[PDB]
Scaffold this motif. Structure first.
Motif, mmCIF file in Angstrom:
data_model
loop_
_atom_site.group_PDB
_atom_site.id
_atom_site.type_symbol
_atom_site.label_atom_id
_atom_site.label_comp_id
_atom_site.label_asym_id
_atom_site.label_seq_id
_atom_site.Cartn_x
_atom_site.Cartn_y
_atom_site.Cartn_z
ATOM 1 N N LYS A 1 0.821 -1.202 0.000
ATOM 2 C CA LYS A 1 0.000 0.000 0.000
ATOM 3 C C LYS A 1 0.862 1.263 0.000
ATOM 4 O O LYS A 1 2.027 1.251 0.399
ATOM 5 N N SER A 2 0.258 2.365 -0.447
ATOM 6 C CA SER A 2 0.835 3.701 -0.361
ATOM 7 C C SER A 2 -0.155 4.623 0.346
ATOM 8 O O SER A 2 -1.326 4.283 0.523
ATOM 9 N N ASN A 3 0.325 5.807 0.745
ATOM 10 C CA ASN A 3 -0.540 6.785 1.409
ATOM 11 C C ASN A 3 -1.805 7.064 0.604
ATOM 12 O O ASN A 3 -2.905 7.135 1.165
ATOM 13 N N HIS A 4 -1.673 7.220 -0.719
ATOM 14 C CA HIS A 4 -2.836 7.555 -1.530
ATOM 15 C C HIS A 4 -3.860 6.428 -1.598
ATOM 16 O O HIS A 4 -4.972 6.659 -2.086
ATOM 17 N N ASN A 5 -3.533 5.234 -1.106
ATOM 18 C CA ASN A 5 -4.516 4.160 -1.032
ATOM 19 C C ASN A 5 -5.543 4.368 0.079
ATOM 20 O O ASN A 5 -6.564 3.675 0.083
#
Lengths: 301, 301
Positions: free
Chosen positions: A61-65
């Protein structure tokens, strides 16, 4: 007068509830300063819930997820990390309504208020006791994961519970706000079930004291008993043992009423052995064990 | 799942509670826009409470006789007037936390949340039903007068109750927010007492439906009954009569469960005639009548 199961006023906690969305999974999160706390199982779907490796899932995952919504305002996620079973999402705005708070873990037999939430929106408030088997008998529908339980002491909110899941018997399991489960449960799909439970004896006695304070006296008697003989009857009826510390905690109630603790234990022994014979205590036909001595003192001053 | 007596989240009401002091009498008031609402008996002492003429007592007061405190900030009173049994104090500051609100009067058998307050400070929240005899079975200690009862619908607070007094049996009486008492009670010291009460039949049936939804089925049976034969048993056990409108209100629950209303009435008839035989329903050994059909639908969606 009167005696009612009472929750703490929930306003301080209402201002902290947000909605956290990851993919097609949405649930509740707790927004304190610039961090949002929520169950880590927001990052998986049902196929992962069967055997999830959360370290793997979070690295993917990334922050924008992560979509975080506080009312209408979308909160920008700038960091994420896992602490045990809770996800921590750093956001770029400190919650201006953050109360004074602490993260505390409670003991079986203690009570707390639950603010049931759906989609970051509070829907109702009620009291729960942590059962001896580390479950709670709550009211949670789908979408309520991440709802929190708390107590309030002089405008300081002590958060003690985050809701994670329902067990097959309809009872509920969750974690403290450090992400550590209450009881032997895990955030994945197994055949896990609640263990055997017992009745919280000190709370039943506290509630009998509440009843005397509110004018219910029919169950009193002239007899006293020893701690040891009482505890032999406790085990027979699946009640927890009574200790000297319990007697000491019940001191102020025993003093206010003039009924020694071991005098009240004699009443409880006879209630357990003979029932009630069609009578009620504080409007219950069953012995109630979800009021602590503290809960009683709070309403019986 | 699970079914719990649940109050509305109280934050919107917490922001409206203030302390009103007149002489040596202090109690709670409700601060909405630039008006504070509180029980008019704040303007008298115990000698007046025996036979008060409130028109006389209010004419003898001035604005500076009323101290209003919202937290620390003292609110300046610039006008006063009486509406029935409530005092209205105009203040020079509009409450910036005023929610959308309405003043509504409720019917016997309907429920609401009570925010118990002391000295303008919220202490706990719980649900109450207006009994058929227009009392409520609350929890109120000295200093709780002026605490309010409310429901919330889409961020609009409907205020329905202001607490005024305790009756000899330990139950409670108050007014709507227009100052009109619920029931045949007055804000003076008489020998007034609660009238005979009855059980709210439609609510008991709603709660049996909640129980079926939560997996309690032991009380069901193959029988049906007519409305008329059911109502003959209702009168025998001091239950309110059941009407076709009640049947219609129970429609959605009857549809969700597949149990016709008159089928459930047969179960209630047998519960009333034979008791429970040591079993429980949703954790009660008594039939519960303080959940409306609406309360049940709210938790059983």
């Amino acid at each position: 007068s009167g005696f009612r199961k009472m929750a703490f006023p929930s306003g301080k906690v209402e201002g902290c509830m947000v909605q956290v969305t990851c993919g097609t999974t949405t649930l509740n999160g707790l927004w304190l300063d610039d961090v949002v706390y929520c169950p880590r199982h927001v990052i998986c779907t049902s196929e992962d819930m069967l055997n999830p490796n959360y370290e793997d899932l979070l690295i993917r995952k990334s922050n924008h997820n992560f979509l975080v919504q506080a009312g209408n305002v979308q909160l920008r996620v700038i960091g994420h990390s896992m602490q045990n079973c809770v996800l921590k999402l750093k956001v770029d705005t400190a919650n201006p309504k953050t109360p004074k708070y602490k993260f505390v873990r409670i003991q079986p037999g203690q009570t707390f208020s639950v603010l049931a939430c759906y989609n970051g929106s509070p829907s109702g408030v009620y009291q729960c006791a942590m059962r001896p088997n580390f479950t709670i008998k709550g009211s949670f529908l789908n979408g309520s994961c991440g709802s929190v339980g708390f107590n309030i002491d002089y405008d300081c909110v002590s958060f003690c519970y985050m809701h994670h899941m329902e067990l097959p018997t309809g009872v509920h399991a969750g974690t403290d706000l450090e992400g550590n489960f209450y009881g032997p449960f895990v955030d994945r799909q197994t055949a896990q079930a609640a263990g055997t439970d017992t009745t919280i004896t000190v709370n039943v006695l506290a509630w009998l004291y509440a009843a005397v304070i509110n004018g219910d006296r029919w169950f009193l008697n002239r007899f006293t008993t020893t701690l040891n003989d009482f505890n032999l009857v406790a085990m027979k009826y699946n009640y927890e043992p009574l200790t000297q510390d319990h007697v000491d905690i019940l001191g102020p109630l025993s003093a206010q009423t003039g009924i020694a603790v071991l005098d009240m234990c004699a009443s409880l022994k006879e209630l357990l052995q003979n029932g009630m014979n069609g009578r009620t205590i504080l409007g219950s036909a069953l012995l109630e064990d979800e009021f602590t001595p503290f809960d009683v003192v709070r309403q019986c001053s």
